Each structure stands twice: as C-alpha cells, then as structure tokens.
Design a protein around this nucleic acid. Structure first.
Lengths: 103, 119, 89, 93, 43
RNA sequence: GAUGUUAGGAGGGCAAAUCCGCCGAAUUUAAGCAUAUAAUUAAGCGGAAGAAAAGAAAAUAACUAUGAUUCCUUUAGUAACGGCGAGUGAACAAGGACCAGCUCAAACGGUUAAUCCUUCGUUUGGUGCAAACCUUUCGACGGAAUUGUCGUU
RNA sequence: UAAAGCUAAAUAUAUGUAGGAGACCGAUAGCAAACAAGUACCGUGAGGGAAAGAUGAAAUAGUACUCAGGAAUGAGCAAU
RNA sequence: ACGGACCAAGGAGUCUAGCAAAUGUGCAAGUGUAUAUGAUUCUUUAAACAUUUUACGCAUAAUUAAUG
RNA sequence: UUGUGUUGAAGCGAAAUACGUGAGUUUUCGUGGAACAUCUCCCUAGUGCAGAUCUUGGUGGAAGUAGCAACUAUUCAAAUGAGAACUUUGAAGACUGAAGUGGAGAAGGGUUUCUUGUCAACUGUGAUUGAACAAGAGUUAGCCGCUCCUAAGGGAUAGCUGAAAAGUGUUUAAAGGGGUCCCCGUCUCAAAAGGGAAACAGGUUGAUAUUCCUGUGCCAAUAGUAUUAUGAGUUAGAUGGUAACAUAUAUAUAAAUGAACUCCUUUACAUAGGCUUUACACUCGGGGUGCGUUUUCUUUGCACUUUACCU
RNA sequence: UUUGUUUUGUAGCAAUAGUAAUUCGUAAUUAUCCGAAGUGGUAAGGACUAUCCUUGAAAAAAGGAGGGAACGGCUUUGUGCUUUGCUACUCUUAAUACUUGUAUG
RNA sequence: AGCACAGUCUUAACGAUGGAUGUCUUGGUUCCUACAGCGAUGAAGGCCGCAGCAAAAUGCGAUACGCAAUGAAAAUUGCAGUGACUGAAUCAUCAGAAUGCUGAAUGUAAACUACACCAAUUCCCUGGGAAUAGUGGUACUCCUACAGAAA
C-alpha cells in the first residue's frame, strides 16, 4: 500500500495552518510582580477578528512599569467587554467580568 | 623596432615614457585601421611586440629592485618568497628530518656501520 | 481537452527550471532550489558518482586547459632552483 | 603580497578603442555635434569623459552609452557647444 | 526577450559571432554552424 | 573561558589505478525458497602516499625447537564451516624475495629545567653571473614549562 | 609480556605522464572518437551521443583557350 | 503454421580454471626443478641455458570415527 | 623453405576444347597501379553464412501512384528579369470588421531587425521573393524598468543530531546600530503585474526613442571655512481667527528653536449593488477652409477646425 | 484703501508647435484653428448601502505629536563656573572664493 | 533517304547509382619499463578575451596564436609585412617576467558585471613631482604568541 492521508498530515507540507492574516497568538500578560501583589489595569482599545478562530480578540494596552512606554497584549475577549473598558489583572483585581484573577 | 638589450640600460622614466609613446602610436594605428585606411595595418604587430618588450624590461627591473629591497629580512612577501609546491613547502626541512636525539646520536657515533672484507 | 496530454500541453512549455550554473557553465542550475544538477555548485564538493564512468570522464581533470599543472609538468626532469636563469651568452 | 609590475588597469589607451565611422556616426558629427567612440565594456560615463578629455582637448555635455552585441561599448559623446565636433573629427581623422 | 541580463546578452553576442563562415583567404589552403530557427541555443 | 581585520601559521577543493576507515544491497546459485550464496561485493560517505597498510610477539610450536612485518612457492580446496544441501574455507611448519630496528610511559637526576619556542642582532666559511642556497655559535629579549621539558636505562 | 608510539626493503598499481615493444585491429575493425570527438546533435535535468580517412610523384602541374548557353554546364581542331 | 522485398559487409560452442579418458612424447619407482638464484646471454632475449652430494606436489600402502 | 612483381602485384568484370565428384584450384582477356604468395613442412586464430521480426549501409516494386482539400476570391495593365498565377506599381472586385493576420508588452527566441547585394541548397508548384545565403550596420535614459522593501518562502549562522553525507534553524548565543553608560538588535536572498523620489509635447532615422534634437520642467544629492545677498526672530525660540483653522509668494511660501524617551498616522489593501461627478469616447447643429456628387435632386456628402507635462 | 462697469489673454506653457488650406525661386509668404448641445460606452474618484462560522499582507520609506535636555556676543579675575566695562545679535535660503582626492546624476 | 509494333522477360557489351573488395595508416589496443600530488603563493573545472585580414581546433592572457633568456640558427609567407651579411625570421628549450573574470572562493550577494566597511592608492626623480574612484585588505574553523577587559 501507500501512505494514507492521515499519515501525510503530519509531514506539514500542505497541511500547515493557513495563518497569513492571523493577528497574533492569544496570550494574556506574562506573570509579573504587579500581578503577584496587586492590580494592573489595561485599557482595551479594539476588539478584532482573528480569521482562524471564532472568538474575537481584544487588544489591551498596558502601561509598562519597568520603563516608560506601553505594551500591547492580545487577549481572548469575554462576552460583554467593550472598547474603552479598563480591565484589572492581578491578585487584588476586583471580581468583575473581563478581569484576570488567580482562580 | 626595439630590442631588449638596448633598453636594458634605460632608467624607469625613459622606459615609461617610451612605453607611453609606443602605446600612443599603436592607438593611432588602430584608429587608422578603424577608418577605411589599411595601408599601415601590418605595423600593428611590430608595435605590439615592442610594447611587450618594453613592459618586460620594466617589470623585470621593478622585480629585481623589489627583491633587492627585501634582501634578507627573513619575512619577504608571499609572492617574493619561494613558489615551490605546497607539499614541498609544508615538508619538514632536511635538518628536522635528520635531527636525532643525544642518545641515538652518541650510539651511532660510537658504533657506526663500518667497512670490512672477508678472506 | 485542448491543452491535452501531448501537443496542447507542450504549447505551454515556457519558463525554464534550469539556467547556466556559473560554476559548470552548463544549463543545469535549478532556479527554484538554487542548486546545480550537474555539479551541485552551492556545495563545496563536485558531485561525482561512480555509477557514471561517462560523466566522470567528460569533466575530469585534463578535459580543460590545465593552465598551471601543465606548466609545473617537466619541472621534475629539470630541477632548476627557483629564481635561476640560464647563463648569459 | 606586493606587486612590482606597472598597473594593468584600463588607462586611456585601451578604455577608448577608436572612433566609429558608420553612416549614423558620420551624420551625427555635424547634425548634433556628437562623436561616436568604441570603448571597452568596463568603461563608464566618467571613464569615457575623462579619457576623451585627456586624449583630445575637448569636454562633453553628456556621454550616452550602449553595450553592443560585438563585445564592446558604444559612446555617443555630445561635445559642448563651445567648440565644434567637425573640427576635432577632422583633426583626428 | 527584450529584458536581458548582461551575461546572457554577452553569450548571445558570442554565439552570433561564432556563426560566421570561414574566411576565404584561410580557405585558400565551418561545420559548427547553426540557424536560429533550426537548432536552439538552449543557453 | 570570552573578545580581537593583534603577529605568525594551518585546514577547506580537485584528482584515484594501486592504498586506508565506514556504510552497505539485490540480481544470482540453491533447478522452488526463507538460513546460506552472491558478498564482508556493487552503489554511497570520508582519508593518505609514491607507494599506503602492516610491523618489532600478552607470536608459534610441543620439536634436536623457531623468532617483527610484507610478498612469492607450498601447506590446501586441506583442518574446518554449511537447510552438513548448494556452496564456503583458513592457520603452523617448509623453500624463497627482502631484511632493521627502535622510543614514549614508568625508574633514576633538585648545591638548583640541566629543557623548548618567538623576535632581534654577530660571524665560520663555501659553491651561484645573478637570483638565491648550504654551513656558523656568541648572545640579548619575550615567553612556554615543576599540573613536568630534558638527560640515564 | 595486552590495554602507548615510530619504522626502510622485498609488495600493488583498469590513474596521470614519458619511453619501448607485439604471431593484436586495419576505417561496419581497433578506444565512443585515425578527422574540428566526448565534437555535432537530443533531453528541463540526471544524462544520451554519432557520422565522417585515401586525386596525383609533383597542384611550386587543381584544368589555360575557343565555341554554344542568362547561367549552370556541355563540346572541341584546345589543354596539365 | 512462423521468418524471409533486394544486395553488400559484420554475424554465433570460444577463453580460463579444475577432473578424467584417449592418443603422442620424455624419463621411470620415480617424475615435475616451484618460487628463486647465476651468467663476459641482455635488438631479438619478456627467450634460451644452468642449479656445491632430504623444498614441495603427485606416485611409491592400505585401513579405521579414532588412540592407531 | 623458394619464389612472382612497372616487360604491371593484389583486387575486380566477363570468360575457359582446363582440372576436380565436390568445396574449389588453375589459366585467358579487360580493368587496375603496388604489392603478393609459398601445396616443403609446421604453428596460430576474432577462419568459411540465406535465414536469427539479425546489425549497419545502400537500393527496389508499390509509383509518376496516394496525394499537394480548413481559413468565401480573384481580375486587367505595366515594371523588373533568362524566365513571373504566388516579386513590385496602378486600376478593379473583395476580406479582416476594433472579441481584427490593427497597435503595445510579458514568457520563450536571439539578430530573425535595417540597408545593399544575391539564388547552390531551402522557401513540399513557380519564384527575380524571403524569417534562406553574403557584406556591412543598427539598440543612446537622473525621470521607462531592474537595482531598494518586504510576502508565500529559500539558503546560511548558533547550537543539537549524524561515521559522514546531510537534517533542523534560537531549542544553555557573551551575536551590529543609536544616542552618551544605557537602549535597540541573527544574517542573507526571494516580486521587470505587490510597496516605490522624479517628464512632458513637438520633431528626427534605413534601422533607436518618455533614451536622440528642440523647448519646457521635475526628483534626489550638494562637505568644511569665509564672504556677500534673501528673509524672518531677538534687548532663549513669530502672529492672526470665538472656533473649525489660517499665515513666510524672498527669482525660490527657505527659516515659526527644540535633545533623550514615547505615541500615533501614511504606506495599507475583500466582495456586491445602485446613485453621482469628471476626463476620454461617440454624436447633433452653426461658422470657416478644401474636396466630392451634380442626366435629375441636394443652402448638400466628407475631411480639418488641435493644445501635453509643469506653474 | 473697499464695491459695482469695460478691454486684453486659448491663464502661463502657446503657437514659435500641430493640422487642414492658398501661393511664391524651388526654402519662404498668407488665411483658419470658434459659437452652442446631446448619448452614456470606457476609466477613475466620491458619498453610501449590503454580505461573511470568509473580515480580505508586510516592510522599506515618510510625516505628525507628547516631552522640555542645551543656550547671546566683545573683553576681563580666580578655579566650564560668580565676577567687572559695552552691545545692536541667531537661524534660513542662494551665489561666490579657498581648502577638501577629481564636490552631479 | 528508308526499315523496325509497344510492353514484359532473358543474355552480352558499355555506362549510371552505390561504396563492397584489395592495398595503404601521424590511430587504436595490450604488455613491459620509469616516475608521480595539485591547491588560499588561489588548484582542477568553467566563462571572457587575444592575430592586420581569424569561425573552429590548437596556443596564449590586457606583454594575450605570444615577451624575455638560452641553444640552433636563415627563413617565414595566402596577401600584406618582418628578417643578417646573428639577443633580429623561424624552430627547440624554457628557469625570468606576466598570467583577465570566476571557481575550495573566502567582505555581503548573484538568471544582479548589484552593495558594503577599513586603509586613499599608484607611479616618477633623489625630500619633492605627478596621475588616479583607481589599488589592497575584510569568510569560517583551528594552533602558537600577544592585548586589555571578568571572580
């Protein structure tokens, strides 16, 4: 016999993900002292569509604390969160929709 | 036409300007050839050979004086130093190849192979 | 159909895959993968194979000028010290 | 490595081969005050301009260049209107 | 095509130059000849 | 260890008939075929010389004993291996070619690394028309080396 | 007397180069190639790959001249 | 039934190893001088010639798994 | 061993009151023009052809046969020429019918282009033609493109595997730049239709034109010092409008201080539908100019009546 | 220095070019190049509406902004800083001259 | 000036086509003998050039069918031309000089004659006088030495 389609899938030639227009990997903020002992609030500036997935992504701007400047994060948006909203991430963040808390 | 031995005694000026005027007349001959004229085309060979001779003498003089400049100094440029085969260059010197320790040297001086006869 | 298996498809034969291969000078340089089918030019080695005596012998040493080794030939029967010249007349 | 032989880069005698005398070049000489030269392919605009300057006492408004199929370069040299192309062409042949 | 590389154009020129007959003064004492439509350069 | 367009050097690629390592088939034969054979072959990868590789016994023998390696004649299609089928298959002695032996480690030397290299100079003479080459030992400098060079056996 | 190392000769050479030979082949043979041969040519490519020698002692004897033809040619009382 | 339109040239039981039989030849219980050596041989000659009084093969004895 | 050859060898064609049973042998004539036998005996082999859909080469009958059938279609006269159905010119009849055998390009080709000759072969008939043959010539760019950027992706570095060959490409990398210690940071290739500094018109050659000429522009670059001149601002940075915002018109709107560090915008983006504006296209009427029809009619039918980039 | 009325100019390019004509030795002269509209074919732009479990590149390069680091000139004390006496001064374009390797493409 | 029927087949003589046979052989083949590495001092291989008229092959490298030197030594010639009355014409040898762009190719690249950085560079006279945008260097790994940084 010959190599079957399922076996050909793992070679990754034409079965690689079509990702030309993807907006970026959806990851929340990297763990930081601010999240360990407090809250850091990021402003959601836009809710965009990632062509691969069905869930909308949220672009959240945080103000860097180590240096002057802003950092942009691509989170997976929860229902009801809206542009211009401030979301709090950290241990002391209030329990509200869109906030990132330790479970 | 010019021979090498006559201009072997010239200085580098009188060699270079002679080369320059030879090249100028060769260029004139080539221009005439490019035009409809072809009467003097046979002189191109002679002028080219004279240019070659002048260049040969000049380059040999320059190489000789460069070798004189780098006389000894044990660190001549690569083109100035010997152009043997690469393997020959990398070979151990005869002195290094024949080098022997004190022990075997004294052994061979004390007991050399010697000539003899048989009755 | 019209650009069928034979003449019709042959009509679409433009766009070469091989070109001149600056190392060999032979039109065997694959343009897409940037590699010569004859000598493997990007590779340092020459891409010879023992199963092709013909291919070996049509581009071995001696099929070209041998600009330098033919010059160094005959030096063994002369053994002139480098820099030496014949005695002048 | 040190070199002692005199430089074998292309100088004026070898950058410019000879003037062209085809019908097109000949008519250009008086029509538009330009000369036509055959040159080695490694010459460039500056090379030809400086070489014609140092070969004949003329300067050029502009030099145009093409590479012929015969392995040489053709230069259309527009001499400045200060002097005349016909007189220099007559001077050199 | 009209668009060419320098090396390709020089090769075309050399191929054209090598397509000329043997001079008569030499014949007074060629087989490697091609036509553009019959045998393609392939180079 | 890093880093250096610091000074001086080396490797790379071609070429292979002979040569040295690796990797590695199947056709074939067995009147089928699977072990076996083809074959420690072909193909593939790498590495040297005018030869290479092997080589001065942790060797044979069992004799009245031989004495590094290689090759030739022979041992010998033998001992042996093998669906003990097809097939495969050495070694010692014997006669010859050639013939060559050696040094590290370890030991010993501390009233003294006794060694080595780099660079800069000096002359002892010689063959060359020249270019260039062979000999020369007084050093000085800077290093390496006792985490061990050299001498002795 | 293992677990370190060096070593010439006798040995081999379908390679390259240079000599010398033969109960060999004699242009469909002998190398593929006696020659402008790994050439011409074919294939996108890896690769495939020919055919083709001889006037005469001398062209420093390669056909002068005439006639007929547009010419190629032909013929001759003409010619090597 | 298959091959053959025609002509020319080319075109197929050979070479080596090993065994035996047959026959010719030499010597004969011996036969073969292997490799190698020497020799005023060295165009031929890469062949011819030669071998200071247990090299080896085969034969000269067979039989047995075998000590024998 | 012992012979033949320029007073003609081998070979070849035809033969012979020839010999043999036969394979063959031997002779004659002609051709040929330089080697050839040995049968005295023996040694040696790539040693004997009718076949193998045998190999290579040459040549037949088929046979002056099949055939020279798409693309509506040619005709008259003249020129050239040795020669004209298929070369050129004029006239006529027609075709292609802007989805064109019309103009521009790409891929591919590579001199087929142009001029002048020219016909051995080719141009499946002819051929004086030709993309054939021969000799010359021809391709001009700051503005058209490549070159630069990045994409799908490719190669390479560091490592890590692997005998290597090779496989992957940040998986323990101390890996160039900026300001003046710190910040950022793999390299390189990949688009002649993506992104992108800047040109138009008229003319010109046998063959080149946004490339040449003429004229008019545009873009980029332009180092240091010192002079002038232009403008602003200043007793270290201007001013108007409530505001949306506007203002430097010097040859030329050049200057409206501004570091590190930042944050944005442009580049920069799908499809469908209609509505609308402009330019180009087409068309109608008037005026002018030229031409055409005119037996009859016709204030008529046709052509020209143009205006680039830049400011 | 404001608002109403006329002439000129194809707004400059520009008529000098082009085109179609009439003549003249065979290169020059002359005349025209202006009065209004309709159709919607093509192209581009605009402002929109709608569709997607499809949302339809990147970088080179360029620009804007936030911020407010640095600060006149001539002379002078001491060790770039406090100081004394006087003020016309800083940028921006263009040209020129000299240095800079030959300072447009 | 007259006569043969035509076709088909057979034979002979002479021709045409074809290239066998014979004879030649600056070639091959096999054996023997001898020597044997080339390369960052840039190889083999590939391109591109070079002659007065010059396509190929052969030779050569911007000094380009050849320079210099050494030995022989008068031719070389298709034309043109060049040669002494022997560094000159031509052979042979080949040691000096020169040896384009590439290629392991090695500054970065490559269907680019594209793009860097560092020294400006080269030549002439015996410190001046010129000319040049031209010339060198810059790969990766490793060894010896050195350098200043680090714990």
């Amino acid at each position: 016999g010959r190599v079957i389609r399922g076996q050909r899938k793992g070679r990754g030639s034409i079965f690689k993900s079509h990702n030309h227009h993807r907006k970026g990997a959806a990851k929340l903020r990297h763990l930081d002292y601010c999240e360990k002992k407090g809250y850091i609030k990021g402003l959601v500036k836009d809710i965009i569509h990632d062509p691969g997935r069905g869930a909308p992504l949220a672009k959240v701007i945080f103000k860097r604390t180590e240096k002057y400047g802003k950092k942009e994060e691509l989170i997976i948006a929860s229902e009801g969160m809206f542009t211009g909203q401030y979301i709090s991430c950290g241990t002391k963040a209030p329990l509200s929709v869109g906030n990132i808390l330790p479970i | 036409n010019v021979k090498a031995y006559e201009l072997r005694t010239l200085k580098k000026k009188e060699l270079l300007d002679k080369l320059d005027e030879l090249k100028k007349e060769l260029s004139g001959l080539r221009i005439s050839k490019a035009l409809g004229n072809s009467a003097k085309n046979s002189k191109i060979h002679g002028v080219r050979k004279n240019v070659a001779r002048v260049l040969t003498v000049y380059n040999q003089k320059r190489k000789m004086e460069l070798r004189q400049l780098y006389k000894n100094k044990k660190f001549k440029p690569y083109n100035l130093r010997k152009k043997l085969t690469k393997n020959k260059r990398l070979q151990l010197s005869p002195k290094q190849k024949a080098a022997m320790t004190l022990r075997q040297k004294k052994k061979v001086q004390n007991f050399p192979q010697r000539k003899y006869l048989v009755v | 159909g019209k650009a069928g298996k034979g003449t019709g498809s042959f009509g679409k034969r433009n766009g070469k895959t091989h070109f001149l291969c600056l190392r060999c000078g032979k039109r065997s340089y694959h343009l897409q993968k940037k590699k010569c089918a004859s000598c493997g030019y990007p590779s340092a080695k020459k891409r010879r194979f023992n199963w092709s005596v013909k291919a070996k012998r049509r581009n071995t040493t001696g099929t070209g000028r041998c600009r330098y080794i033919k010059t160094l030939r005959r030096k063994l029967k002369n053994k002139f010290t480098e820099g030496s010249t014949p005695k002048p007349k | 490595i040190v070199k002692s032989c005199h430089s074998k880069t292309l100088d004026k005698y070898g950058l410019i081969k000879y003037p062209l005398t085809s019908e097109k070049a000949m008519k250009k000489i008086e029509e538009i005050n330009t000369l036509v030269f055959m040159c080695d392919k490694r010459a460039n605009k500056k090379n030809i301009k400086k070489s014609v300057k140092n070969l004949f006492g003329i300067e050029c408004d502009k030099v145009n260049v093409l590479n012929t199929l015969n392995g040489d370069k053709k230069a259309y040299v527009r001499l400045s209107g200060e002097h005349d192309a016909l007189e220099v062409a007559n001077k050199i042949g | 095509g009209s668009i060419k590389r320098f090396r390709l154009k020089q090769r075309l020129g050399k191929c054209r130059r090598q397509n000329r007959p043997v001079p008569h003064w030499y014949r007074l004492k060629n087989t490697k000849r091609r036509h553009w439509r019959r045998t393609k350069l392939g180079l």
